[PDB]
Design a binder for this molecule. Structure first.
Ligand SMILES: CN1C(=O)[C@]23C[C@H]4C(C)(C)[C@@]5(C[C@@]41CN2CC[C@@]3(C)O)C(=O)Nc1c5ccc2c1OC=CC(C)(C)O2
Ligand SMILES: CN1C(=O)[C@]23C[C@H]4C(C)(C)[C@@]5(C[C@@]41CN2CC[C@@]3(C)O)C(=O)Nc1c5ccc2c1OC=CC(C)(C)O2
Ligand SMILES: CN1C(=O)[C@]23C[C@H]4C(C)(C)[C@@]5(C[C@@]41CN2CC[C@@]3(C)O)C(=O)Nc1c5ccc2c1OC=CC(C)(C)O2
Ligand SMILES: CN1C(=O)[C@]23C[C@H]4C(C)(C)[C@@]5(C[C@@]41CN2CC[C@@]3(C)O)C(=O)Nc1c5ccc2c1OC=CC(C)(C)O2
Ligand SMILES: CN1C(=O)[C@]23C[C@H]4C(C)(C)[C@@]5(C[C@@]41CN2CC[C@@]3(C)O)C(=O)Nc1c5ccc2c1OC=CC(C)(C)O2
Ligand SMILES: *[C@@H]1O[C@H](CO)[C@@H](O)[C@H](O)[C@H]1NC(C)=O
Ligand SMILES: *[C@@H]1O[C@H](CO)[C@@H](O)[C@H](O)[C@H]1NC(C)=O
Ligand SMILES: *[C@@H]1O[C@H](CO)[C@@H](O)[C@H](O)[C@H]1NC(C)=O
Ligand SMILES: *[C@@H]1O[C@H](CO)[C@@H](O)[C@H](O)[C@H]1NC(C)=O
Ligand SMILES: *[C@@H]1O[C@H](CO)[C@@H](O)[C@H](O)[C@H]1NC(C)=O
Lengths: 205, 205, 206, 205, 205
């Protein structure tokens, strides 16, 4: 009936180390990077320092409860949940998580986990100080799950790419495009999926 | 009763991972910053390194006990308590909490959590070296709770804004204004509340 | 009967999250800083990096045991003990604890917790390169316990201020004075207590 | 059974603090460094800052389950598994793990743990600005397990040395060779095994 | 007995927080530093950054077992063991432990804990760029145990001073001497013991 019951009941069924595959179908994870800031850019070392929302949604039907005469959503610590093992492939620093580590769980089992992350990347910084700008490509996918266990797809909101971008950054955003790739590597027989986020940005003035 | 008994009861009653909303009424959180130091400012990157008390006040009326023949108040570690999931939206560093992580809990269920935090912010540093100074705006609100779960209000009684501000800072405070915002974003149908703190400050002339 | 027994009996009565007051009297905490080093000084930013022992003593009668056929004292991890919530009010960095987090506990329930700490302070560094030197003032008190719950007093045994100060520092100590303040603030009706430690130091000459 | 039963069983029988030896044979560990980036190099101090995958494989046959009808692989938190106590002998910083801390456990008991690590090393940086380049040697072996308890060989995979190395690095990889050593030391009458990775790299242009 | 039974016997017998003294007598601790690297030196501030093995051996005969038809030794995590509360008295940084936190336990009850540590020291750096070099003195002893509870003594042999010292350091070791001291201090009536390590080193030319 209350939010304590809902949580207790999540923990009875929720297995944080068990991927919540429905039948033998992958977990469909939505990924959308929302850039908040570009703090440090190095044209010689080809490194950028960015703040972004790593917006991550998926379904876990074992979390699902009856929202009749109950709250329809709750905030849940991510240690009580299974969370995709997403890694930015071209990161050169540990993710610095700036926000409380809470997921929004809906009563149909939908999970919204939207951390704000500060992280350093190896990417093409050339042309940052030009009209056309530089294009930094950030690849995010699962570390240990191939395409039959986790699929990753870009979702976008219709709103402008820089509606949440700091006006006090030295840089401005020209365009953010998100591409899905499905690649088979030399380690493993199954294909791994990633979202490739192309940040087209340049200095102001 | 005694202090041991009050702490034991809180351990039995307090659900750290469950928002204490009785009858689906929003938890009213009092948020206000008291600035202690300004350590670093960068005119070009528009970044500031500040020390402040993040003064957080609310009621968890499940914690409440009868203090007729018992202490009125106890200091409690915050790990035993629910604490609001507040984030500084324009912070570019994790909060460096400088103080023991204890909240003061009153017999009526009022919780006083007043950590001292060092944190870096992306904000307007323009004019900092002038007599008018810069106005750095810092927004704080819940990360995962809308207005019907967490409301945020500023505690705006008549006090000196520099009362506890270090005389040994290279900077000085002209004014601190605190204002409540209620905004509906595209993500979600419900309004999210935030307190915007406007720090008017300058390099000492 | 042995050290094992004492640590077990401590773990049965000790409540690390419960302040061990006797009657409605405050816990009497002795705080004194012993300066080991001054590492980084900046007169422009008014910031100092210092290494000091934060010598902290108090009574916890919940720890007390009968030491007739038993050892008088044990070393105990501080996680098993209540420890005062002391903060250096003008610190600008979290304390960097250099030493094992063990307290010495005597059978009468006296606790001696003497961590070596490196910490950065916002204080008055003006005059550091003069004969008179700078006077940097450090204020240490409880974060959450008013004067009816924690009293702080300086432990002044009239020692040499430089007794344990590094000869290899670029700085030397001219004097250390430690005084108790009782102040009532706008937040609260009850008085809060602090020890104010005044470190008068200078750059060495030549 | 469902992946929940496989994972519950793995961590049920798994003994993280006990080396899973079979019939007094050493636990055969395979080690391989895949170089992703060189971030900082200092020829004066002879220090390099490297991002690399530490590819570690071994068998714990006590984890084996029948996978005729079941999934034959699962992702498991390393905290639940025994892990070889490997150390980079000439590292001058603790390893910074960038990636989710999950191993891949196969139905026959094989464990694949491939963390992405940022670490600093003491090694020969002389010649980095020349055409021949510098050769930085990284030694990796057990800290407490001799050759009768842990053996360490390089994987037979002599892949492309610069396969996943960033095109956006300042540096380029010329050659990577991996050789095994068996050394006896003054401390100990038993031999200790290590893989020596020789990284021949230089600045581009 | 297998490696698990030996560990479980240690866990039922060893107490991390209880010093394993016999009657009124101290635990005889052997301490020797083995210098691996000297990374940063500053003759103005008298500060050194060094990597060394803190080689710590002692006996706990309560841990002993019959090894005739069982393993002679096991690696054990230090959280299962009492370990000496040793501090480097003139350290100005927290010990950065570079290596897995495992002790070697022998069937006769000897414990060998040999962490590799990077740590900064306040000590005499004067003459480091000369033929005589600097003599940096490091003192190691128990933080909380007097001489009737813990005795410290240097290990019986410095096989060679430069044996495992990095040939890639800007510095070289001329000599290492390790002597024992027993000192009565103003705090306490009981004598404390320490090992004074004198590192005679110079810049290479
Ligand atoms: C060597 N690898 C493994 O064994 C697996 C699956 C592999 C992949 C596909 C994620 C892996 C490394 C990975 C990391 N994973 C750990 C266990 C594993 C079997 O799932 C891989 O094999 N190739 C990767 C990988 C990650 C990221 C990547 C890859 O390829 C190229 C460029 C960059 C930008 C570095 O992006
Ligand atoms: C995308 N988002 C979510 O899905 C929710 C609620 C959203 C809000 C309202 C807190 C969110 C991001 C948030 C963060 N939250 C995580 C889960 C969530 C549904 O509660 C949001 O949607 N808009 C925000 C937000 C945070 C801060 C913010 C926002 O808007 C504009 C400027 C800045 C200064 C960056 O401040
Ligand atoms: C705002 N505050 C509180 O509400 C209480 C008690 C307050 C005090 C008295 C410790 C507090 C902040 C404190 C910290 N505590 C957290 C809960 C509390 C009621 O115990 C305070 O109210 N004033 C303080 C305080 C700390 C330090 C300090 C203070 O005053 C002036 C200057 C400097 C040098 C910064 O030193
Ligand atoms: C002194 N040492 C010990 O007592 C053991 C086993 C030893 C070895 C062989 C791993 C040890 C240090 C080690 C570390 N181990 C901890 C317990 C031990 C008995 O397993 C050692 O004895 N020699 C080592 C060692 C580690 C690394 C090393 C060594 O030798 C040469 C060069 C460098 C680059 C420094 O690499
Ligand atoms: C003040 N101190 C105590 O009360 C005790 C025992 C003391 C000693 C002897 C370890 C202590 C500090 C110590 C640290 N210990 C914590 C509890 C204690 C009673 O064991 C001490 O009292 N003198 C020390 C000490 C440590 C290191 C040291 C000391 O003296 C001289 C030079 C330097 C280089 C600073 O080295
Ligand atoms: C949810 O609860 C309602 C009211 O109690 C009930 O009618 C309905 O059957 C429940 N839903 C499911 C899926 O059982
Ligand atoms: C608290 O307890 C006292 C004494 O037991 C009692 O008189 C009083 O009614 C109680 N308070 C309330 C609000 O009921
Ligand atoms: C301590 O124990 C002894 C017996 O060993 C006893 O005589 C004495 O009364 C005890 N002390 C106290 C305070 O009870
Ligand atoms: C695995 O499972 C099958 C089907 O249950 C069983 O018949 C068989 O004995 C097992 N196979 C092996 C090789 O152990
Ligand atoms: C150790 O065990 C063997 C039998 O396995 C036995 O011969 C020997 O006596 C035992 N040692 C001791 C000291 O009891």
């Amino acid at each position: 009936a209350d939010r304590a019951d809902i949580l207790y009941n999540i923990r009875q069924t929720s297995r944080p180390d068990v991927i919540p595959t429905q039948r033998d179908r992958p977990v469909a994870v939505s990924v959308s990077l929302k850039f908040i800031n570009i703090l440090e850019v190095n044209e010689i070392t080809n490194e950028v320092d960015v703040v972004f929302w790593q917006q991550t949604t998926w379904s876990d039907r074992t979390l699902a409860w009856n929202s009749s005469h109950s709250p329809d959503q709750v905030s849940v610590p991510i240690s009580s949940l299974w969370v995709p093992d997403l890694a930015a492939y071209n990161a050169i620093s540990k993710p610095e998580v700036l926000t409380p580590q809470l997921a929004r769980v809906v009563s149909d089992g939908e999970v919204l986990y939207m951390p704000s992350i500060r992280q350093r990347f190896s990417c093409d910084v050339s042309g940052v100080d030009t009209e056309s700008g530089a294009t930094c490509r950030i690849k995010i996918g699962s570390w240990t799950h191939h395409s039959r266990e986790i699929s990753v797809d870009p979702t976008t909101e219709n709103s402008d790419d820089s509606e949440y971008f700091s006006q006090y950054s030295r840089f401005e955003i020209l365009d953010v495009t998100q591409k899905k790739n499905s690649v088979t590597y030399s380690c493993c027989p199954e294909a791994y999926e990633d979202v490739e986020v192309s940040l087209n940005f340049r200095k102001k003035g």
